[PDB]
Amino acid sequence: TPVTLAKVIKVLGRTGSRGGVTQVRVEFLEDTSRTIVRNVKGPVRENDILVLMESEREARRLR
Amino acid sequence: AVPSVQTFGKKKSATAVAHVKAGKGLIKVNGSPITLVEPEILRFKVYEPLLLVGLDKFSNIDIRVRVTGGGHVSQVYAIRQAIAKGLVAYHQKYVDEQSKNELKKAFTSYDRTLLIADSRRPEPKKFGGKGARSRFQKSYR
Amino acid sequence: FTPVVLATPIPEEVQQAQTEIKLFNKWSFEEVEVKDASLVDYVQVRQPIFVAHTAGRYANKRFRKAQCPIIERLTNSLMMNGRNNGKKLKAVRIIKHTLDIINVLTDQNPIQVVVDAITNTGPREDTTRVGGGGAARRQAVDVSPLRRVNQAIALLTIGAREAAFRNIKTIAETLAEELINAAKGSSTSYAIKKKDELERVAKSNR
Amino acid sequence: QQQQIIKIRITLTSTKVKQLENVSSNIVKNAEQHNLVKKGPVRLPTKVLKISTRKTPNGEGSKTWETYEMRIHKRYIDLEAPVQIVKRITQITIEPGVDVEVVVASN
Amino acid sequence: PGVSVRDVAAQDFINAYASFLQRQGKLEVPGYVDIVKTSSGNEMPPQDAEGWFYKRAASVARHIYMRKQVGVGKLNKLYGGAKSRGVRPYKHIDASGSINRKVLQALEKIGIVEISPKGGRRISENGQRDLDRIAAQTLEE
Amino acid sequence: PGTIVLYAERVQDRGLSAVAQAESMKFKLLNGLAIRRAAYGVVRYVMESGAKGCEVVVSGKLRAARAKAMKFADGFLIHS
Amino acid sequence: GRVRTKTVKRASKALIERYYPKLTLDFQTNKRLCDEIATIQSKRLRNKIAGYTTHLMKRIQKGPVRG
Amino acid sequence: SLVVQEQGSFQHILRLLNTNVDGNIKIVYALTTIKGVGRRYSNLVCKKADVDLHKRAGELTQEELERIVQIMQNPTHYKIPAWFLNRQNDITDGKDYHTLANNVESKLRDDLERLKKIRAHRGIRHFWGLRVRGQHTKTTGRRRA
Amino acid sequence: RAQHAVILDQEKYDRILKEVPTYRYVSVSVLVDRLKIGGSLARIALRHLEKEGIIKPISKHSKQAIYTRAT
RNA sequence: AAAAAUGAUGAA
RNA sequence: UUAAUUGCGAUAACGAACGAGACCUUAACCUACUAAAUAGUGGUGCUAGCAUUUGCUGGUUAUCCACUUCUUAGAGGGACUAUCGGUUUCAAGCCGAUGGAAGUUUGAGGCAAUAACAGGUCUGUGAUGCCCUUAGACGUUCUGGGCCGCACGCGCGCUACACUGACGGAGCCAGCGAGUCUAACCUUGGCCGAGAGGUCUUGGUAAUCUUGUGAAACUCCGUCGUGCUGGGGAUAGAGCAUUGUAAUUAUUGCUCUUCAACGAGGAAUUCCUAGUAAGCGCAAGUCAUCAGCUUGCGUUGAUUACGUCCCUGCCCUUUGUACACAC
């Protein structure tokens, strides 16, 4: 089943030339010890749950 | 003589004045029953102060509301605030404030503007556009 | 329940509304639940309202609109053509009619059907423009839950409005068919096919 | 002849709140200091006279607009008193910028 | 109990009092009905060709009952709407005065309104009598 | 006749009246006095009269065909 | 932003250097005292001066303040 | 509700004043196909011919259709206000006329030719094809005027 | 260019009295697109059927009528 | 690490 | 760090000034003061109407007695980011919650430095230098015409492309104004008229009357039924009125008739972050008449984002310069 639930534990900052994307760190729900960094489109909070279609790509374009 | 209070509710520029007093259960708005308040899609807005706390504590009072100013929606909101605040004032003046606080918690938990008037006010229009913020269309060639 | 005898007569349908707060005195918010985790506490169906009209202040804080009732947010996005700005009375009438039509067409809770449509029509992945070069590019990113519910509501109402334009069908009927198709996944609904299109572009630009 | 009634009304119009309230207070205190039963100074709604005009004398530049306004404050005091003291209150409680006109009525 | 024409819905009362006048057939319609379009701001005559004058008479009677006294100019402003001015923006336009004046005269003939020395036409003894009985009938239909 | 009456009153602190200072300096310039001498005399008189600040601006073709502004100030002035 | 200007800062400093024993930690009575111990042209400026005086008094309670 | 089950006597598009009147549009708005009758004129003609307004033109019988034609062709003797007409107090005989289907363009040509023959300014402007009612011609009316 | 029956003959009427009792949701646009009839006949047909009681109303409104099957 | 040329004479 | 040359501070500078802020106006709170027939409310208070256990009303300081919740306006109060928690290297501050009418500088404005621009205005001025003209006048008046002319290009706009609608009936609610005897201004009411209008009176120099400006979007019920169709109302014909000395090159209004393009608009490009955008009308300016314009006012009231420096630009610092008319 290609749906991964990950919870935002930290908001890193804004990315994108126009600032539209947000760096976040999320930990997986199935195992609470595997954290990854993702790029998110809209407004995000800590503890927000994201849906990861794919769950291996590290986020590029950092600051 | 008869126990009574007078309150008011206020939306943008509408003002409703409610006379609440020891009575029978009469609820009137501009001399007409609250069941005929318009619009009917918003009639439950003025039903809310009754249903949240229950009619068993409206069954011994009569309220008469006179609303002026504003528009059709603002007058409905003014009416509901006037009714809720009239109930609160009557329970303040002739019943215990344990009951008053029960009423206030019920109202403020359901909706804040039942007791406190919305503080949003119109922004004056400025020269150079149709509104407070919007400007006339600007051309360069 | 021993209706109260009262000098201003209240009809029994309004008397029964004392028991619990009921949307249009027809549809209950109790047992309605978001069946898509990550969208709980962004689809707010926990505090009941009698009607999808309240003059609430959800614009003065960043995330304040997440507590706005989801039926009211759906109503608010119906007030959108330029000729329909304002007209919340019209939008609320449309919402009431489409909820009735949903309950007649499918014997489920209309609020639950709306919630399922919103949870099913929010894109999980999207793309953003990147590259100050000559040829720009799209880079895949993920979508926040608030943006997911925002864009789900936008797609549902935009598809209903575009399908109601210039045809015999009423806007309430078209919105009912849109919500009913989206609540199960049909790919005949504008919102579902736009969500799949965005997710497929995001995968292609991954 | 024996302390006749008049039902007099004094009205006060000005563009200066301080001096207007000064003369109004002088009239009022004269009423109390002649132990006179009255209807206190009723203050009318303020009249804001607006003139909105372009700032430029020609028609060049950004289209900027000024709004000037006069402000008219009016009060009236109802009284009933003998002639010998209504006249002295006519000849006193006056100063520039406040105009006073006095009307006999039955109100 | 106590019934006045404020406990009944506006349109309900209007349609019932209009049907009453339709059965009674005493209003003495002016004669130029079905050629006029009821307002300079209107585009078409009333669609209910055989009952629009009775609808108007019922509306005017209820309006007079609600207010103290009302004249022809106020009926013209009340029933006037906005006028489509082609490629110009809309504006409010007063309704046709002859129709309202003859409605008022017809109600004077049937004894519903009188001369109201302070104003225009006001409600009568018998006007209150019949409008209140018909309102009671509409409530306990 | 008999309902209009005029009195003339002497102005205390003449050095604090901008109208009177501007009229006096106008007459000084009309008598052929130099702009700097006149402007500084006005500023000195105003400051000796007790003013917190004073300012004199002279604008126009002061010297040549091309116009310019000369500005003479003393003390402190507020603007807003 | 809510940064106090040098007018408020210096007035509060002078008030504390003159009237520390009279001043307290409560804004209401500090506001009341500012009218008698100083002449402030506006009520808004007096409120700002009193609230920065009480903020500095709260700072002084938990150790000394430079200046 | 006027639920009707009428037998196979329905008539489609029909000819009044050598004009093609449709038989599927309601009588009032179907008559407006004829040049010289508008929505007001059609409403008044139908309501003075005493036909049911909630009827399609196709189920009107021929005798009430001819009553409609007579009322339209000679309106002034059917209690019509006359201020309701198309050509009142004309320049030739001073009679109150209502110009109809094929006569509208011919009477328009008559007015045009009268103005052009007398060489009035409005007729000259018509001869040029420009606007005649005093409108500005600098910017608008370019693609055809 | 849609063609809709503006006059009701026997076949269309019997098709109404048979198909309409089956429809679970019934309205003006439903009759107009599933029976090839104008909105005016659609409104008349809804008003006709309600009086006998083979469709019943949930919500009667101008510009939107809500009917279901009788039971 | 995409592309981006030019701007008449005199003139406190 | 702040919106801020706003502060904490650092310090060959010390102490100051302008600007910012402070200030003023306006909007929101006050069941606390002082009142009010030019604002209201109550009194089986007076009188009278309708319907029957009493509700809705009509006249009420000029037919009375009380009161100030609503309205008004003087004096004041109120917020100071208050309290609590977190965070910064203490600090300046910042974030969140609570309480509160109000917690973006509470919202919006007014005012606003130095130095400039060959920016606009000589067509506002009996502000004005110089030049020109000055009786066949470029002075000042009268009549008529023009400024509006039409192969075409551009800017601001109005009306639309419809069913989230058009039309009909009914419902039925604002705020900001303005108004005449130095004369014909705002006009209720009655009568006539299909309308536009006419006519007899009336009130108002105005919280008093127009006016509750019964505005329009809007709501309900009905007709229409996806058809350039009852969408849209351009163009044109005929007639009736009003303003004015004069309406033709249609002043405008009204009635009937004709019923064009337009089915949402290429490249492009504007404005906007909450009672805001947008929809909707109203008053004032202009004004004899003419508002598709503007200045304000209220009615209905979203979506989206609380960010960035990609584009267009702004501020400060460092740096390079063959620029200084300043890329």
Swiss-Prot record, chain B:
Residues annotated as carrying Phosphoserine in the record are S32, S59, S74
* Bias type Basic residues, positions: 132-141
Phosphothreonine PTM positions: T68
Q: Name one Pfam family in it.
A: Ribosomal_S9
Cross-link (Glycyl lysine isopeptide (Lys-Gly) (interchain with G-Cter in ubiquitin)) at residue(s): K28, K45, K57
Q: Which GO terms describe its cellular component?
A: 90S preribosome; cytosol; cytosolic small ribosomal subunit
Q: Which UniProt keywords apply?
A: Acetylation, Cytoplasm, Isopeptide bond, Phosphoprotein, Ribonucleoprotein, Ribosomal protein, Ubl conjugation
Which molecular-function annotation in GO is an example for this chain? structural constituent of ribosome
Signal peptide from the UniProt entry? none
Classify the main location: cytoplasm
The protein's location, in the record's own words, is: Cytoplasm
Sorted alphabetically, the Gene Ontology BP terms of this entry are: maturation of SSU-rRNA from tricistronic rRNA transcript (SSU-rRNA, 5.8S rRNA, LSU-rRNA); translational initiation
Sequence segments annotated as region (Disordered): 121-141
Q: Does the keyword Acetylation apply?
A: yes
This protein's assembly is summarised as: Component of the small ribosomal subunit (SSU). Mature yeast ribosomes consist of a small (40S) and a large (60S) subunit. The 40S small subunit contains 1 molecule of ribosomal RNA (18S rRNA) and 33 different proteins (encoded by 57 genes). The large 60S subunit contains 3 rRNA molecules (25S, 5.8S and 5S rRNA) and 46 different proteins (encoded by 81 genes).
Q: What else is known?
A: Present with 33800 molecules/cell in log phase SD medium.
Which protein family is it in?
Belongs to the universal ribosomal protein uS9 family.
Return the protein name.
Small ribosomal subunit protein uS9A
- UniProt source species: Saccharomyces cerevisiae (strain ATCC 204508 / S288c) (Baker's yeast)
Curated annotation (Swiss-Prot), chain E:
**Could you tell me where this protein is found in the cell?**
Cytoplasm
In terms of InterPro entries, this protein maps to: Ribosomal_eS19, Ribosomal_eS19_CS, WH-like_DNA-bd_sf, WH_DNA-bd_sf
The record ties this protein, via SMART domains, to: Ribosomal_S19e
Q: Which consequence is recorded for altering R101E? A: Decreases mature 18S rRNA, protein binds 20S pre-RNA complex poorly. Lethal in double RPS19A/RPS19B mutant
* One of the GO BP terms on file: ribosomal subunit export from nucleus
* Recorded consequence of changing I64P: Lethal in double RPS19A/RPS19B mutant, considerable decrease in 18S rRNA production
Q: Name one Pfam family in it.
A: Ribosomal_S19e
- One GO MF term, please? RNA binding
GO CC annotations, alphabetized: cytosol; cytosolic small ribosomal subunit
Q: Does the keyword Manganese apply?
A: no
| SUPFAM superfamilies for this protein | Winged helix' DNA-binding domain (SSF46785)
Effect of inactivating the gene: Disruption of a single RPS19 gene reduces cell growth; a double disruption is lethal. Depletion experiments show the proteins are required for correct maturation of precursor rRNA to generate the 18S small rRNA. A specific site between the 18S and 5.8S precursors (site A2 in ETS1) is not cleaved in disruption mutants. Partially assembled ribosomes are retained in the nucleolus rather than being exported to the cytoplasm. All effects are exacerbated in the double disruption. Increases association of NOC4 with 20S/21S pre-rRNA, decreases association of ENP1, TSR1 and RIO2 with 20S/21S pre-rRNA.
Q: Which UniProt keywords apply?
A: Cytoplasm, Ribonucleoprotein, Ribosomal protein, Ribosome biogenesis
Q: Which domain of life is it from?
A: Eukaryota
Q: Which family does it belong to?
A: Belongs to the eukaryotic ribosomal protein eS19 family.
Q: What is this protein called?
A: Small ribosomal subunit protein eS19A
Q: Which gene encodes it?
A: RPS19A
Swiss-Prot record, chain G:
Coiled-coil segments: none
Where is the protein localized?
A: Cytoplasm
The record describes the protein's role as:
Component of the ribosome, a large ribonucleoprotein complex responsible for the synthesis of proteins in the cell. The small ribosomal subunit (SSU) binds messenger RNAs (mRNAs) and translates the encoded message by selecting cognate aminoacyl-transfer RNA (tRNA) molecules. The large subunit (LSU) contains the ribosomal catalytic site termed the peptidyl transferase center (PTC), which catalyzes the formation of peptide bonds, thereby polymerizing the amino acids delivered by tRNAs into a polypeptide chain.
Task: Tell me the protein family, please.
Answer: Belongs to the eukaryotic ribosomal protein eS17 family.
Q: Other notes on this protein?
A: Present with 30900 molecules/cell in log phase SD medium. There are 2 genes for eS17 in yeast.
Oligomeric form and interacting partners: Component of the small ribosomal subunit (SSU). Mature yeast ribosomes consist of a small (40S) and a large (60S) subunit. The 40S small subunit contains 1 molecule of ribosomal RNA (18S rRNA) and 33 different proteins (encoded by 57 genes). The large 60S subunit contains 3 rRNA molecules (25S, 5.8S and 5S rRNA) and 46 different proteins (encoded by 81 genes).
Which protein are we looking at? Small ribosomal subunit protein eS17A
Query: What organism is recorded for this protein?
Result: Saccharomyces cerevisiae (strain ATCC 204508 / S288c)
Classification from the root reads: Eukaryota, Fungi, Dikarya, Ascomycota, Saccharomycotina
Q: Which residues of the full protein are shown?
A: 2 to 68 of 136
Curated annotation (Swiss-Prot), chain H:
For this protein, what is any one GO molecular function term? rRNA binding
As stated in the Swiss-Prot or TrEMBL entry, residues carrying the post-translational modification N-acetylserine are S1
Q: Does the keyword Calcium apply?
A: no
Compartment(s) where it occurs, according to its Swiss-Prot or TrEMBL record: Cytoplasm
A Pfam family cross-referenced in the UniProt record is Ribosomal_S13
| Residues that bear N6-methyllysine | K47
Top-level taxon in the UniProt lineage: Eukaryota
**Which keywords are on file for this protein?**
Acetylation, Cytoplasm, Isopeptide bond, Methylation, Ribonucleoprotein, Ribosomal protein, RNA-binding, rRNA-binding, Ubl conjugation
| SUPFAM superfamilies for the chain | S13-like H2TH domain
- Protein family according to the UniProt entry: Belongs to the universal ribosomal protein uS13 family.
* Assembly information from the UniProt record: Component of the small ribosomal subunit (SSU). Mature yeast ribosomes consist of a small (40S) and a large (60S) subunit. The 40S small subunit contains 1 molecule of ribosomal RNA (18S rRNA) and 33 different proteins (encoded by 57 genes). The large 60S subunit contains 3 rRNA molecules (25S, 5.8S and 5S rRNA) and 46 different proteins (encoded by 81 genes).
Q: In the UniProt entry for this protein, what further remark is given in the free-text comments? A: Present with 48100 molecules/cell in log phase SD medium.
This chain's function reads:
Component of the ribosome, a large ribonucleoprotein complex responsible for the synthesis of proteins in the cell. The small ribosomal subunit (SSU) binds messenger RNAs (mRNAs) and translates the encoded message by selecting cognate aminoacyl-transfer RNA (tRNA) molecules. The large subunit (LSU) contains the ribosomal catalytic site termed the peptidyl transferase center (PTC), which catalyzes the formation of peptide bonds, thereby polymerizing the amino acids delivered by tRNAs into a polypeptide chain.
The protein depicted here goes by the name Small ribosomal subunit protein uS13A
Encoding gene per record: RPS18A
